[PDB]
Each structure stands twice: as C-alpha cells, then as structure tokens.
C-alpha cells in the first residue's frame, strides 16, 4: 500500500510536533511492507512568506494527489496584522473547503496518569472513550441572511441553514464511525424547538435503518451538556450540528485532563481526510523543546484508522502514547502522575522506543 | 414594609414544599416588623381540575395585585392525556409571558456538605457562587422563518432574531444584578461569528458606562463552556442570550451537587418577580413527606432580595439552609455528607430552629 501523505506543518511549533508524527509513522509502517511517501507543502504564515498567500496554489495540488493530509498549526505575530484577507488562518479555512471536509472528529479518552489533573473526580472520568463528530459546512456560521435591519438597524438576524445532503452525509459518517467503534451513537439536537433539529432527528432515524448493529439514541444539546460532566463514560460516538459541536467539543476538551494532547480529524465521504492536533501553533515557545508531540502523534493514528483502515498500526501508536504517559513523561504542559519533564524530541524517542 | 405575595403551590410536592417555604418566610419576617400577606391561587393541574385550564383567570388577577409570585411546582400524570395547552406546564409559560418576565436567573452556589455529590473535584467547585442570567424572549427559539423549503423540501432554516430592546433590558438587568452582588459581570456571546452577538457585545459595552463600578468581561460561549468546569469560581454574574443561556444554565446545574435544590427567579425590568425551585412536582413521592423543601426556601430567599431589597432576611435564610446542611440533614434525595434523613416537616423545623 503506497500511502501518499501531504505534510503541512505550518507555523510555530507546527513543524516541531509534525516531526514526531513523521518519525513515529515511518516506524509503525516501514517494517511490514507499507510504503509511505511524504511531500511537504506550505500553509499559513510559512506560505505567506514564500508565496505571499496563506494557501499556495501548489499546495492544493500537492494535497489533491495525496491520500491524506498531515497538518500542524498556523498563525503567528509576524502576520497578525496584514489584511485578514491574507492571514495564516484563512489559508487553513480555504484548505478545508477546497478539500470538501465536512466532518470534524474530536475523540476524547482518559489516561490513567492524567486522571489527577482532570477537573472531574476519578470515578466520573476514568473510563471515558468518546468521539464528537461536528458538522463543518452548514449552520449559523454560514447561514445568510445575517445583518442588522432598520429602522435604525434595531433588529438583527443570523440564519441557521442546512440542506438535506449536509445533514445526511454527516450523520451517515457518524454511523460508520460508530460501526467500527462500540456500535453506539447518540444524535444530539434541540428537536423540540428548532426545525433544523426536527429534520435532523428524522434523518438520524432514517439512517439508523441502514445501520442495524448501531445503537442510536437522541439527546438534546442542553442535556448532553450536563451528561458530559455527570456521566461522560456513557458515550461512544456523539454527532451534532455545527454550533452544537463547537460548544460541546470545547466542553469535552477539558474533562479528561488531557487538553493539550487532543487529536483531531477532518473527514468527508471517501477515506480522504486531514489530521492535525487540536492545539495551536504556540509561536512564542517554538524551538524551545517544550512543544508536546502527543496530540499530533495521536492524529497520525487517527489517520491510519480513518484513511487507511490500518487499525492494528493505529492501535500500536496509541498504546505507545499511553505507555510513555504511563511512565510519567510530559514536556511541561500536562500534569502527569510522577511527572518527568523532557523535551519534544526526548519524548518522541521514548515513543518510537516503545513501538517495538 | 407591607408586602403582598401571590402563592401558587401547584401540584405534586408543590403544596408540601410551599408550606415549608412559607413557614420559613413567616418566622423570618416576623421578628422585625415587615407585614406580609399571602394570597393563594391555583395553577397547573390544580387549576385544570378546577376550571379545565392550567392558568385560570382569577389567578392572573391575584398575581397582578401582588408584588411578587412564589411558585411551587406543576405537573402530574393525571393530565398527561390532555392536549398541551390544557396541561400543567402551560400555566407556567403562560404566567411567565403574561407577566412579561424576560430574565431567568439561575444561581449556583457551593454547599460544603454537597461537594461529595459533585462530578467535579472539590478544589474546582468549593468556591462556586454565581448566577447565570438567560434572555427568555428572543433568540433562535422564536425567530422566523423556521421551515423547510424545496427543492423536494430539502432546505431547512431557523432564525436567530433579536431587537435592541430585548438585548438591552436583559443586559441591563444583569448589570443591575452584578451591582448588588460581587460587582462582576461576564457577557457571554459568540461575537466572532454571530452578527446578533456583535450587537450584543456593542450593547453590553455601551451599557457598562451606566454601571462604572461593575467589571465587564466578554467571553465566548464555547469557552465559557470549558470554564464552568475548569474554573467555575471565577464567575459571579453571567448574562447570555436565550439558547446559550439554555445550554449554560443546564451545564452549571450539576457542578455543585445541589441539583435537587437549586432556586430560580423569572424577573423583568422593574421589581416584580416569580420565584420557583428548579425542580419539578415529583408526583411519585407526593404526600409522603419526602419532598426537599430547600429549593423552594432558597427561592423565597431570592424573592426577599430581588423583589424587596431585604438583603438581611435573604442572607438569614440562606445561612439557615447552609447550617442545616452542614449538620447532614436532607429528605433522602440529596447526597449530603454524613447524612441524616428526615421529613419535609422536620428539615423545615430545623431551618426555623436554625433561624432563632
């Protein structure tokens, strides 16, 4: 299997962490009979510098011929002022659209040595292993109209907009995800109030028919909001609209005390996707050795799982992450049990070390 | 000080927890002067049984006469087959609207002996003492259009609509509230994308001027979502739109282990207010003396503060509730540390006792 990967590390610690992922990937694969070709491309401030554009035309080409995209992060002070038209961030938004990625997977699982750091009591969070799927293309964030309205513009409106295709494909993906996980999907909406939620539930219920083994259930966003605190262990896969996914993923991002090493996947219908850590570029700590490579490494694992169906490998990588953490190593950000602070590379070496 | 009070016990455990709250209300206002009068009135299932309607005409009149409304709970299996507008729940919404109450206040406070029941680690919530103010009239919940549109009715939309008047009266009441508390307010919005959120911030910023000694801060809903978990103690008063308030008050309803006794107040511009425990009628245990009066009692506490500026009395009640809990007394629903189970009447007797 000749895997074609597009490496787009980006700004700040972007390239630092990316290096971990690439090292770990080469290891995991190259030892069985799995080719993997990397091709670097600029994006964000790095591309602004070498091509006056957050998203270089050549980058899209690089990506369009690759089986998946490995991305770090973008943004930096060096560009925090030029026209918002040509800011690092825009190049990323464009890449998402240009690739037609509509789903955002934000898995959240507990790690024994990170429990003390969790804001929740040990008992509440110790078995968390969920994934929140967020719709990216529709919702209030894209809905038009959206403006003030006379007289004197003392009226305002934002529009929650969705198409049957958008809602269908996202849900369809959530079922596929749940199928290969614990066959359990909670569809989250506000169906007793919003017509888009009403339609959403119907489509969820429709799709459930094509996925018999998956245990579908519905839960309102306001309830899911407290369930993620009171009994987050109950979830396997959660799927929801754009703004609900936005708020819920942020809430969930702190329950296991692993915020800072959370992985992220952006998918569409085919097996093509864009993997990246949830954290930003942390420009000011670049080159200092303090960047945490875990998030990005866990991304590469998701990549192997979602884009190539290589669950064996993807799983190996994840155990390594658990084990290194099990020994108590972090780079200063995570508050691990019996913590020993090492550098981004030291931590990577310990990782690849565990991988055999 | 001659205060007229409209008292609507309601159904289920409503009458039991209402007697309790009144007894406390009485003993407190007695030793001083403050002359008060309680005008009873039907509501919910009790009114349905007496006029085939959940919100009788005479009840509205009794309220309009009164300076504030003290509400128990409504609901019950006996009316579950009736059509929506001919059920308990509607008397409330009706009365809420009929009185033009646009602000829902949900205070969350930490009680030492209840922490063991919180999903969060004590350190995180031991100092929690906040109030979330939710806009009740506008937002995405009422905005029109809300429909599906062809082709093939595969385009749905909901509208988040707000008018300056609605956005101002609420932010106004929040600043007022922040004033009589720890003079700190957090305007929670999603201004980095929602146009309605931009107008909200603008109106929050300009309003700030009228209240110079109240520190205004701006926070995004998704962030505030993480913060209620990571650091809920930072908050004093939060003010946010309908939907966001809907999700945020629900999330915060669990962080202190006092879900079963949280108090609530529906207010409007002037000083008329409706006070009720967040909890339901709980018909299951109706009449068994198992009902927890605490919620209705703390609500009465809120009434004395927001509807009569009687700060001393309010505090006297809250401190009594605190002490009775510190001794480990509950009715069997709360998981109080070193628990002692008693009846509604008794937990009440003990509060009254703690008062003298």
From Swiss-Prot, chains A, B:
GO terms for molecular function: 3-isopropylmalate dehydrogenase activity; magnesium ion binding; NAD binding. PROSITE patterns: IDH_IMDH. The record marks 141, 190 as: Important for catalysis. The keyword Oxidoreductase applies. One of its GO terms (biological process) is L-leucine biosynthetic process. NAD(+) binds at residues 76-89, 280-292. Pfam families: Iso_dh. It is found in: Cytoplasm. Pathway: Amino-acid biosynthesis; L-leucine biosynthesis; L-leucine from 3-methyl-2-oxobutanoate: step 3/4. It catalyses: (2R,3S)-3-isopropylmalate + NAD(+) = 4-methyl-2-oxopentanoate + CO2 + NADH. Its cofactor is Mg(2+); Mn(2+). Mg(2+) binds at residues 222, 246, 250. Its EC number is 1.1.1.85. It is an enzyme of class 1 (oxidoreductase). Substrate binds at residues 96, 106, 134, 222. The keyword NAD applies. Binds 1 Mg(2+) or Mn(2+) ion per subunit. Keywords: Amino-acid biosynthesis, Branched-chain amino acid biosynthesis, Cytoplasm, Leucine biosynthesis, Magnesium, Manganese, Metal-binding, NAD, Oxidoreductase. One of its GO terms (cellular component) is cytosol. PANTHER family: 3-ISOPROPYLMALATE DEHYDROGENASE (PTHR42979:SF1). Catalyzes the oxidation of 3-carboxy-2-hydroxy-4-methylpentanoate (3-isopropylmalate) to 3-carboxy-4-methyl-2-oxopentanoate. The product decarboxylates to 4-methyl-2 oxopentanoate. Homodimer. Belongs to the isocitrate and isopropylmalate dehydrogenases family. LeuB type 1 subfamily. This is 3-isopropylmalate dehydrogenase. The gene is leuB.
């Amino acid at each position: 299997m000749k895997m074609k990967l597009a490496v787009l590390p980006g700004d700040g610690i972007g390239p630092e962490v990316m290096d971990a992922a690439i090292r770990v990937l080469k290891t995991v694969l190259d030892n069985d009979g799995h080719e993997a070709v990397f091709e670097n491309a600029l994006i964000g401030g790095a591309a602004i510098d070498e091509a006056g554009t957050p998203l270089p035309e050549e980058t899209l080409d690089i990506c369009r011929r690759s089986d998946a995209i490995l991305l770090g992060a973008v943004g930096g002070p060096k560009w925090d002022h030029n026209p918002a038209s040509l800011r690092p961030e825009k190049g990323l938004l464009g890449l998402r659209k240009e690739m037609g990625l509509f789903a955002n997977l934000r898995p959240v699982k507990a790690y024994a040595t990170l429990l003390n750091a969790s804001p929740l009591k040990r008992e509440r969070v110790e078995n968390v292993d969920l994934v929140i799927v967020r719709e990216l293309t529709g919702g209030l964030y894209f809905g038009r109209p959206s403006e003030r309205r006379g007289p004197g513009e003392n009226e305002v409106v934002d529009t929650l907009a969705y198409t049957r295709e958008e809602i269908e494909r996202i849900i369809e993906k959530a079922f596929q995800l749940a199928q290969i996980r614990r066959k359990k999907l909670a569809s989250v909406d506000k169906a007793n109030v919003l017509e888009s939620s009403r339609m959403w539930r119907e489509i969820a219920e429709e799709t459930a028919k094509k996925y018999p083994d998956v245990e579908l259930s519905h839960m309102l966003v306001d309830s899911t909001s407290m369930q993620l605190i009171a009994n987050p262990g109950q979830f396997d896969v959660i799927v929801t609209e754009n703004m609900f996914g936005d708020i819920l993923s942020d809430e969930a991002s702190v329950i296991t005390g692993s915020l800072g090493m959370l992985p992220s996947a952006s998918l569409r219908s085919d097996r093509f996707g864009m993997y990246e850590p949830v954290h930003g570029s942390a420009p000011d700590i670049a080159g200092q050795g303090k960047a945490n490579p875990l998030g990005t490494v866990l991304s590469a694992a998701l990549m192997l799982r979602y884009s190539f169906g290589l669950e064996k490998e993807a799983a190996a990588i994840e155990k390594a992450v658990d084990d290194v953490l099990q020994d108590g190593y972090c780079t200063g950000d995570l508050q691990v049990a019996n913590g020993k602070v090492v550098s981004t590379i030291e931590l990577t070496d310990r990782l690849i070390e565990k991988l055999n």
